[PDB]
Amino acid sequence: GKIFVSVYNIQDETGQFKPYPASNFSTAVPQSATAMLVTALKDSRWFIPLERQGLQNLLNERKIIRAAQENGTVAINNRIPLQSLTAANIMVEGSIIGYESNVKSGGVGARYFGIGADTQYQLDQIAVNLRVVNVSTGEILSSVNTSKTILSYEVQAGVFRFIDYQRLLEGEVGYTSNEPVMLCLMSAIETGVIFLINDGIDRGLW
Amino acid sequence: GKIFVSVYNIQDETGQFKPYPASNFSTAVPQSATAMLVTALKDSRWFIPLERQGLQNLLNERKIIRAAQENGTVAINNRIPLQSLTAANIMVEGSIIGYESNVKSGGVGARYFGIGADTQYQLDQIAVNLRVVNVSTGEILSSVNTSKTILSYEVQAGVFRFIDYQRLLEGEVGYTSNEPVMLCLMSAIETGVIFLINDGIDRGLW
Amino acid sequence: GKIFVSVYNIQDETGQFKPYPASNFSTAVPQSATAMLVTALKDSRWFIPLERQGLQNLLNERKIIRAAQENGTVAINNRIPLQSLTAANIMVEGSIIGYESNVKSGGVGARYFGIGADTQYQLDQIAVNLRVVNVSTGEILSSVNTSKTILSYEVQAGVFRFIDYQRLLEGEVGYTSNEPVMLCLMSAIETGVIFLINDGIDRGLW
Amino acid sequence: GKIFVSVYNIQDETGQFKPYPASNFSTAVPQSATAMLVTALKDSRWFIPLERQGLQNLLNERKIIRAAQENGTVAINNRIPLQSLTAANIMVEGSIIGYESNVKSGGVGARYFGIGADTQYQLDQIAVNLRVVNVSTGEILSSVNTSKTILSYEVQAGVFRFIDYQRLLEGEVGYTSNEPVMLCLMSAIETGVIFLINDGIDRGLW
Amino acid sequence: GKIFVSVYNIQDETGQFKPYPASNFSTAVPQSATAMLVTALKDSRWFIPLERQGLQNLLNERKIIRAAQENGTVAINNRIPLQSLTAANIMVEGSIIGYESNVKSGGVGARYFGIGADTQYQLDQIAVNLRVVNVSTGEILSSVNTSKTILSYEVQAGVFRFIDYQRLLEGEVGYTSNEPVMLCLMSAIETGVIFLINDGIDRGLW
Amino acid sequence: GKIFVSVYNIQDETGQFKPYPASNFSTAVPQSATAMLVTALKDSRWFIPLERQGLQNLLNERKIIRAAQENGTVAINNRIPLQSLTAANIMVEGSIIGYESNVKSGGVGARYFGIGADTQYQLDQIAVNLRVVNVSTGEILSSVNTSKTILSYEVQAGVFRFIDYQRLLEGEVGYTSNEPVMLCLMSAIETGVIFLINDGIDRGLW
Amino acid sequence: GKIFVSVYNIQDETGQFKPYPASNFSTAVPQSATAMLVTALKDSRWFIPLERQGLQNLLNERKIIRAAQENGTVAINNRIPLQSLTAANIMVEGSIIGYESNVKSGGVGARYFGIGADTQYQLDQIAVNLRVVNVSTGEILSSVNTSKTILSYEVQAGVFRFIDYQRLLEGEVGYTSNEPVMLCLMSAIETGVIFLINDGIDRGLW
Amino acid sequence: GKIFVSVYNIQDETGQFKPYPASNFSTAVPQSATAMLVTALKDSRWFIPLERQGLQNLLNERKIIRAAQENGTVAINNRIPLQSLTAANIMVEGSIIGYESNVKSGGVGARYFGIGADTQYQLDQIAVNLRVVNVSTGEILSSVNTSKTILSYEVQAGVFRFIDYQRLLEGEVGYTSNEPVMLCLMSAIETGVIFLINDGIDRGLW
Amino acid sequence: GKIFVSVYNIQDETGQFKPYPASNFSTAVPQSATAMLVTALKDSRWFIPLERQGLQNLLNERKIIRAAQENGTVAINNRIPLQSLTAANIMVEGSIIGYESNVKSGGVGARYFGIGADTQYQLDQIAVNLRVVNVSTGEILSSVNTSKTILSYEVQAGVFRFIDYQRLLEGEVGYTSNEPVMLCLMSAIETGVIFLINDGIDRGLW
Amino acid sequence: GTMTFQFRNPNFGGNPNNGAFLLNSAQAQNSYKD
Amino acid sequence: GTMTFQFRNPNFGGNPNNGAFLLNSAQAQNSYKD
Amino acid sequence: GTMTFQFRNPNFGGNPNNGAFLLNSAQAQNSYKD
Amino acid sequence: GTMTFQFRNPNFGGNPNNGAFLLNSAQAQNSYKD
Amino acid sequence: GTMTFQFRNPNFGGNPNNGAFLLNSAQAQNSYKD
Incomplete structure (x- = not known):
């Protein structure tokens, strides 16, 4: 059976x-865990997530359902049987516990006569803490801290030499690749969920 | 039959x-999902959206209707039969879970004697999470994460050489194309809705 | 008959x-839809708008009317018969769902010996979502997304050559045209209202 | 008879x-409509405005009047007969629906040997929406959108040539004229009031 | 008799x-009308102003008076007979409806060999709306809009020529005069009060 | 007898x-009138100020006194007889109605061969409104507006000529004097208090 | 006996x-009077300060004491006899009424061939108002305004001449001294306390 | 037995x-202790952490459990026995008491003809206070302050000399290493937990 | 016996x-006294600190304990005897009363031909006020102000001369040392605690 | 708006960028020799 | 407004842009030889 | 604090003001002829 | 206001714009030859 | 206040405006020939 998780x-x-030029209010990490985590728990075949984030919307919608069919006049096909809000035995708390910008930067750039080329790289690091909590007792059943590096590199090349007496050939080829922080946060959350699963397996639970 | 969705x-x-020069308060993504999503659900022939975003306006208007015709004096043609607030069996929660600026930039620019030309491109990435929630039980029936790239390119060309002894011909032709983030967000939401539809089909529901 | 719309x-x-040099708090779109929309609905011969935006002012004024003539002493000519707040059968919700700055910029500028001239253009894009909602049931009867481009161009010309040995003639002629975002928002709202009208016609309603 | 308007x-x-150098908090339009509009309605010989903006001050002052003369001891000459708060049959809602900065800029500047002169102009645009609302029913009796251009021009001239071998004559004459946005807003509001008056005349009302 | 005004x-x-270099929070107009206006009404021999701005301080002080002498033990010389809060028959509402910076700038500066001199001027404009309100009925008895220009000029002169072979004489004389915005606001308020007085005279009142 | 004033x-x-370089939150005038005014009233031998600014501290301290000696156990020497909060017959309201920066700037600077010297001056202006209010009736007994100029000058001198072939003597002597805005505000408040005193004398009161 | 003061x-x-480079939120004066003043009153052998700033902490701690020993089970040695909150007969209100930056700046710097030296000084001014208030009546027994100058000087010297043909000797010695604003505020508060003491002595009190 | 800790x-x-270029709102230390500490306590085999940070989520989930199975209709396998919220005998309070940026910076860089190389290092310092509190009495059983240095170094090397007459070889190799502040905060918290454990051992507890 | 202190x-x-480049919101002093002070009181063998900062967490945890074992079902070994919240006889209030940046800066830098070296130092000053308060009466038993200087120095040396005809040797060695403000604040708090201890000893208490 | 007096010369009054042009324009008109 | 003393020379007092004009204007008047 | 790698050359890595001094100091040591 | 010590030389202490004027004014007084 | 180490040379350490003066003052003392 699949475990309900809240x-x-x-x-x-x-x-x-984020640092300049980015806006001062632009966070370094998405504020959208609890959706990457709910998706990681759903996509792992072990859990059934329950809403709990948007529970007030669910309770208002259940108020609307309950007031639409309390008079017994709703067409018996399109009436919605509210059973009760399914409850979870465990609960996954957690946070993005840290984002370090440029834990390891670096770069090598050479340039002979005219022709030159450089490479640059930056490694950010994002850490996610995930806690499986026992809802019956409140005890924290398990707690893992998963780290993930975010590589952002950049390769450029260029020519600025003269081809003839008064003929100048300039040229430039550039490429940049920033690993999405949302993809790396999803990867850290998926690894943390794998760890929580294997831990709950390896001691009694699950 | 079409499924009511809230x-x-x-x-x-x-x-x-958004980064400089944009304002510090100018978000990178429109705050106007729940309108792109309601439109995506309506335009897919599977769902009937219910308001739920503007429900307080609807409830105040129903108060006004109810107080306008409670005295039985309203002209029997222009009285509004309030039935009851139609309720949804499912509920689509979700978010824009991430926006990455310049996941892949690049550019190539050459320039021979006078005549030059360059190209530039940037790929942003926007990810949207959509959850179909079972309003009866609260369980998350399905949850998808759809990503969409936002291409912004730029092509320029220019001449700055001399045509005669003391005659300088300058010239410049430029073009830029930023893919609208609202269009790419609508595309991600439409793909997520297609996925939710096909998932609800492929297991029991719908 | 004309349809009351709230x-x-x-x-x-x-x-x-708006980006620099504009203020950080200066929004890219007017905050004054619901007045462009109420005007678009009134100017279309199909609807009678009801206030609903300024309803608290209307309710305070009706309190003042009701307390001015409850003692039966007001001069029978200048007493105001309050009937009841007219109610709407439909309700137009909506938003400005997106504003993209420079979806397509461009420019061509040539300059021969002294005499030069350039052109520049920018296309912004504004999208408006309009929903006709059924107040009886709450169901969204229709929902349209209308987009409108905002063209801003600029043409300059100039001379900076020498006319004689030591006689320099400088000259400059410039013109700029920014399409008002309020005019383009009004155009998008009017097109959305036309679409809502034709849709309500084309299926049962209206 | 004159119509009471609230x-x-x-x-x-x-x-x-306003853009730089102006402060970030300095709005482009005065926050002082409802005083330009009350003055436009008063100065048109059709309306008697009632306070309604400062109604809490009026109600506190009426509390003070009522508590000063409830004991019947006030000198019978300087007692203030409170009749009742006069009520309006119509109500003018509205807004400044849009301000566009530089809808049309331009300029021409020539400069021969030493002597030069330029002209510049900018047209802003301010739009005002005015709604006559029927207080009995709440229906919007009329709604107009009035636009007004705000011209700001600037003419300069200057000399920087040499008069003798080593004698340099510099000179400059400048003039600038910014049309007040409060004057143009008052003009738009007055035109909107004229339109509301002629509309109420042209169909039944007034 | 003098008219009590609130x-x-x-x-x-x-x-x-105010624009740069001034602070972003430094308003262009003093926030201290209702003190320039109360002074304008007091200094005109027609009105007796009542506090109403600082009425909570007056009510707390009257609480203190009332609690100090309710036990009948206060020395009969230094007990304060509270009569009742004197009430006003009219009430002067109003605002500073607009401040335009540089409605008319200008300047002329000449400079022959060494010796030069310039003049500059800026005209701001401040508009004040004053409404006499009838406290019995709430009707706006009168409403005036008074404008006042704020002249700020600047005259400079300077010498930078050579007196001998290698002897340079520099010199500069400058003067600036900014008309106080508080003085011009007081002048606009005094003119508005004169207009309200003459209007109340010219039709029945006063 | 001395008059109690609140x-x-x-x-x-x-x-x-204050303008740059000062902080954006650094006000041009001290927020500490009501302490300069209470001191001006105390130091004039006509008034006894009562606290009223810090009245909540006084009421909490009187609560503490009252609860410390209500049980009749306090040592009869160090018990504090609370009489009652002494009340004022008049009340001095007021404000700093305006601060103008550089109502009159100016400067003259000469410089012959090497030796030069300049002077600069700025006049700010601070205006204070003081109202004597009759606490019995609420009527404003008197209202004065006192202005005070704030002179800030600066004198510099300097030498930068050569004394020998290759010997350069530089020298500089500078002095600056900013009149404290707190001292000028205290002077304006003292003059306003003198005016209020002489006015209350010159008509009946005092 | 020592006087209890609150x-x-x-x-x-x-x-x-503080001005740039300091932070915009960094106040020019410590927010920590009432601790410099309580210390000045304690260190003067005339007063016993009572807490009153941190009175809520004292009341919560007395709640904890009272609830710890109300059951009569606490060990009779470590039970805390709460007597009652000692009350003050006088109360010292006050403020830092003003801080002027650079009331008097100045500097003299000479520089002969190579060797130079300069001095700079700035005088800030801080003013503190202290009021002794009579808690029985609320009357302000005394009020003093104490000013204190804050000297900040700076002496530099330097050599930049040549010692040989192509041998350059540079040298620099600098010293700066900013008088702490907390020390000068403590000095102003101590002088104000001395004045309050001598005043209370010189007329009846104390 | 393992000790429950809250x-x-x-x-x-x-x-x-963080300083520029970082955002003004970007804290120098993660706000995510209580998750590094809960993980440090869990990973030490001495403690069982209880949730207490997310206790409202746990209480809402227990409300949902309690309301889902109060009717006795839930399937007897998937009903959740709520026992009671497990309580802790001790409680670990604490803070990140200080972050010092660049307590020790330094660097050495040499450069001979063309070839050069430099090293740089910065040491930040982070201090964490951890208090074991006795929940029965409230007494602080133990309190430790753990400091941890954060090393950030940077090594660069470069060539910019000429290889031939007119052939310039440029080259650059760079490396940077910033120790994550989250890793150093976790290290300080782990050392503080080790100290708390050994202290509780070394005197009675544990 | 050890004294309980709250x-x-x-x-x-x-x-x-902190000044630029630091963030505008980055305080000059840690906000983490009451943890340095609680640690200073604990580490001095005279006091037992009680929580009081985190008392709401302690009270919620005691609620949880009390509700976990009120039914008498908890296992008799792991039930927590709540005695009562231990109370303090004294209470240490206090503040960081002042931080002065650069009370004494200075520096000496010499540079002969090529080889140069400089030293720099800055002294900040931090002052802490500590008050021992008598919880029974509220009287401030003692109050001390402890100051501590924060030395930040910097030594650099460098070579930039030529070694051969066209061979340039550059070199640089730098060292910086900022005394942690948290360490100096802890030192000031420890000295203040030593003073409070010796004062309580030297007069009756302790 | 507000107008504040500032010296044009960098000598006695602050703005240093003016001096480069000032000395050049005074030397462009310096008709003295010897 | 507030006035703060600043040295005009970059030598002893901070503003470095003044020195370029200062030395040039002192050399434009340097009438010494040998 | 945080340290971020930046190239010293304006060639390949961004800061352009370094190049003026870099080329001059490379030409001040350029001992090659012909 | 607060006064903070800064070195005038770009050598040992930070402000680089001073050095251009400093070396020129030291060369304008360099009376050494050979 | 806080003091942070920065290199004076634009070579190896960031501030590029120093280099113009540095090379000139090193060439003003370059006593080598050939």
Whole structure:
């Protein structure tokens, strides 16, 4: 059987924003864990997530359902049987516990007569803490910290020499690749979920 | 039959804003999902969206209707039969889970004697999470993460050489194309809705 | 007969502000839909808008009317018969779902010996979502997304050559034209209203 | 007879502020409609405005009057007969629906040997929406959108040539004229009031 | 007899702040009308202003008076007979409806060999709306809009020529005069009060 | 006998802050009138100020006194007889109604061969409104507006000529004097208090 | 006997912050009077300060004491006899009424061939108002304004001449001294306390 | 037996943010202690952490469980026995008490003809306070302050000499290493937990 | 016996932030006294600190304990005997009363032909006020102000001369040392605690 | 708006960029020799 | 407004852009030889 | 604090003001002829 | 206001714009030859 | 306040404006020939 799991909020507790030129209010990490985590738990065949993030919308919609069919006049085909809000035995708390910008930068650039070329790389690091909590007792059944590096590299090449007496040939080829922080956060959350699963397996639970 | 679906809020959980020169408060993604999503669900022939975003306006208008015709004096043609607020069996929660600026930039620019030309491109990436929630039980029936790239390119060309002894001919032709983030967000939401539809089909529902 | 329509709020859900040199708090789109929309609905001969945006002012004024003539002492000519707040059968919700700055920029500028001239253009894009909602049931009867491009061009010309040995003639002629975003928003709202009208016609309603 | 009209608030829904060097909090339009509009309605010989903007001050002052003369001890000459708050049959809602900066800029500047002169102009545009609302029913009796251009021009001239071998004569004459945005807003509001008057005349009302 | 007048608040509805180098929070107009207006009404021999701006301080002080002498133990000389809060028959509402910076700038500067001199001027414009309101009925008895220009000029002169072979004489004389915006606001308020007085005279009142 | 006077708050209604380099939040005038005014009233031998600004601290301290000696156990020497909060017959309201920066700037600087010297001056202007209010009736007994100029000057001198073939003597002597805005505000408040005193003398009161 | 004195809050009513490069939120004066004043009153052998700033902490701690020993089970040695909150007969209100930056700057710098030296000084000014208030009646027993100058000087010297043909000797010696604003504020508060003491002595009190 | 420990909040009381180019809102330390600490306590085999940070989510989930199975209709296999919220005997309070940026910077860079190379290092310092509190009495059983240095170094090398007459060879190799502040904060928290454990061992507890 | 002491909050009343390049929100002093002070009191063998800062967490945890074992079903070994919240006889209030940046800067730098070297130093100053308060009476038993200087120095050396005809040797060695403000604040707090201890000893207490 | 007096010369009054042009334009008119 | 003393020379007092004009204007008047 | 790698050359890596000094100091040591 | 010590030389202490004027004014007084 | 180490040379350490003066002052003392 699949385990019902209630993810309420995976808060972005990193406190980091992006440096210039980015906006001062542009956070370094998406504020959208609890959706990457709910998706990681759903896509792992072990859990059934329950809403809990948007529970007020669900409760207002259940109010609307309950008030639409309390008079017994709704057409018996399109009436919605509200059973009860399915509850979870475990609960996955967590956070994005840290984002470090440029834990390891570097670059090598050479340039002979005219022709030159450089490479640059930056490694950010994002860490996610995931806690499986026992809802019966409140005890934290398990807690993992998963780190993921975010590689951003850049390769350029260029020519600025003279081809003839008064003929100048300039040229430039550039490429940049920033690993998405949302993809790396999803990868860290998926690894943390794999760890929580294997831990719950390896001691009694699950 | 068409399925009633209640979209309350598709929040912009990306946390991103636009970099300089843009304003610090100018978000990178429109705050206007739940309208792109309601339109995607309506334009797919599977769903009937219910308001739920503007439900307080609907409830105030129903108060006004109810107080206008409770005295039985309203002209029997222009009285409005309030039936009851139609309820949804499913509910589409979701978010814009991430916006990455320049996941892949690049450019090649050559320039021989006078005549030159360059190309530039940037790929942003926007990811949208969509969850079909079972309103009876609260269980998340399905959850998809759809990504969409936003291409922004730029081609320029120019001449700055001399035509005669003391005659300088300058010239420049430029073109830029930024893919609208609202169009790419609508495309990601439409793909996510297609996925939710095919998933609900492929297992029991729908 | 004309249909009473209740427009409560057409919110500016674009999240965009203007770039430098403009102020950081200067939004890219007017916050004044629900007045362009109420005017578009009134000027189309199909609808009678009801206030609903300024309804608290109307209710305070009706309190004042009701307290001015409850003692039966008001002069029988200048007493105001309050009938009841006329109610709408439909309700037009909506938003400005997106504003993209420079979806397509471009420019061509040539300059021979002294005499030069350039052209520049920028296309912004504004999208408006309009939903006709059924107040009886809450179901969204129709939902349209209308886009409108905002062209801003600029043509300059100039002379900076020498006419004689030591006689320099400089000259410059410039012209700029920014299409008003309020005019383009009004155009998008009018097109959306035309679409809502023709849709309500083309299926049963209206 | 003159029609009592209740103007509660003509909000500055333009969302615009002024660009640099101006402060970031310095709005592009005065926040002082409902005073230009009340003055436009008073100065047109058709309306008697009622306060409604400062109604809480009026109600506190009426509390003070009522508590000063409830004991019947006030000198019978300087007691203030409170009749009742005069009520309006119509109500003028509205907004400043848009301010566009530089809808049309331009300029021509020539300069021969030493002597030069330029002209510059900018046209802003301010749009005001005015709605006559029927307080009995709440229906919007009329709604007009009035636009007004704000011309700001600038003419300069200057000399920087040499008069003798080593004698340099510099000279400069400048003039600038910014049309006040408060004057243009008052003009747009007056035109909108003229339109509302002629409309109420041309169909039944007034 | 002198007319009691209740000035509650003359709000700075101009929305303007000062441009750079001034602070972003430094308003262009003093927030201190209702004190310039109360002084203008007092200094005109027609009105007796009542506090109404600082009425909560007056009510707390009257609470203190009332609680100090309710036990009948206060020394009969230094007990304060509270009569009742004197009430006004009229009430002067109003605002600073607009501040335009540089409605007319200009300047002329000449410079022959060494010796030069320039003049500069800027005209701001401040507009004040004043409404006499009838407290019995709430009707706006009169409403005036008074404008006042704020002249700020600047005259400089300077020498930078050579007196001998290698002897350079530099010199500079400067003067600047900014008309105080508080003085011009007081002048506009005094003119508006004169207009309100003459209007109340010229039709029945006063 | 000395008149008890209750000064609650002399608010800084100037709205001005200091220009760059000063902080954006650094007001141009001290927020500390009601302490300069209470001191001006105390130091004039006509008034006894009562606290009223810090009245909540006084009421909490009187609560503490009252609860410390209600059980009759306090040592009869160190018990504090609370009489009652002494009340004022008049009340001095007021504000700093305006601060103008550089109402009159100027400067003269000469420089012959090497030796030079300049002078600069700026006059700010601060205006304070003081109102004597009759607490029995609420009528404003008197209202004065006192202005005070704030002189800030600066004298510099300098030498930068050569004394020998290759010997350069540089020298500089500078002095600056900014009149404290707190001293000028205290002077304006003292002059306003002198005016209020002489006015209350010259008509009946005092 | 020593007089109990209750200092609630000595607020920083100067409104000043520090100029660039300092942060915009960095006030010019410590927000920590009421601790310099309580220390000045304690260190003068005339007063016993009572807490009053941190009175809520004291009341919560007394709640904890009272609830810890109400059951009569606490060990009779470590039970805390709460007597009652000792009350003050006087109360010292006050503020930092003003901080002027550079009331007097200046500097002299000479430089002969190579060797040079300069001096600079700035005088800030901080003013503190202290009021002794009579808690029985609320009357302000005394009020003093104490000013203190804050000297900040700087002496530099330097050599940049040549010692040989192609041998350059550079050298620099610098010293700076900023008088702490907390030390000068403590000095002003101590002088104000000395004045309050001598005043209370010189007329009846104390 | 393992000791239940309740970590409510380990607040970031350092008050520090990151310097330019980083955002102004980007804190210097992660706001994600209480997750590094809960993980440090769990990973030490001495403690069982209880949730307490996310206790409201746990209480809402227990409400949902309790309301799902109060009717006795839930399938007896998937009903969740709520026992009671397990309580802790001790409680670990704490903070990040300080972050110092560049407590020790340094660098050595040499460069002979063309070829050069430099090294740079910065040491930040982060201090964490951890308190074991006795929940029965409230007494602080133990309190430790752990400091950790954060090394950030950078090594660069480069060539910019000429290889032939007119052949210039440029080259650059760079490496940077910033120690993650989240890793150093986790190390400080782990050392503090080791100290708390050994202290509780070394005196009675544990 | 050891004295129970209740430290509620040692507030950072300095009002200072760090200058550029640091963030505008980065305070100059840690906000983490009450943890340095609780540690200073614990590490001095005279006091037992009680929580009081985190008392709400302690009270919620005691609620959880009390509700976990009120049914008498908890296993008799792992039930937690709540005794009562231990109370303090004294209470240490206090603040960081001031932070002065660069109370004494200075530097000496010499440079002969090529080889040069400089030294720089800055002294900040941090002052802490600590008050021992008598919880029974509220009287401030003792109050000390402790100051501590924060030395930040910097030594650099460098070579930039030529070794051969066209061979340039550059070199640089740098070292910087900023004394941690958290270490100096801890030192000031420890000295203040030593003073409070010796004072309580030297007069009766302790 | 507000107008504040500033010296044009970098000598006695602050703006240093003016001096480069000032000395050049004074030397462009310096008709003295010897 | 507030006036703060600043040295005109980049030598002893901070503003470096003044020095380029200062030395040139002192050399434009340097009438010494040998 | 945080340290981020940046290239010293304006060639391949961004800061353009370094290049003026770099080429001059490479030409001040250019001992090649012909 | 607050006064902070800064070196005038770009050599040992940071402000680089001073050096251009400093070396020129030291060469304008360099009376050494050979 | 806080002090952070920065290199004076634009070579190896960032501030490029120093290099123009540095090379000139190293050439003003370059006593080597040939």
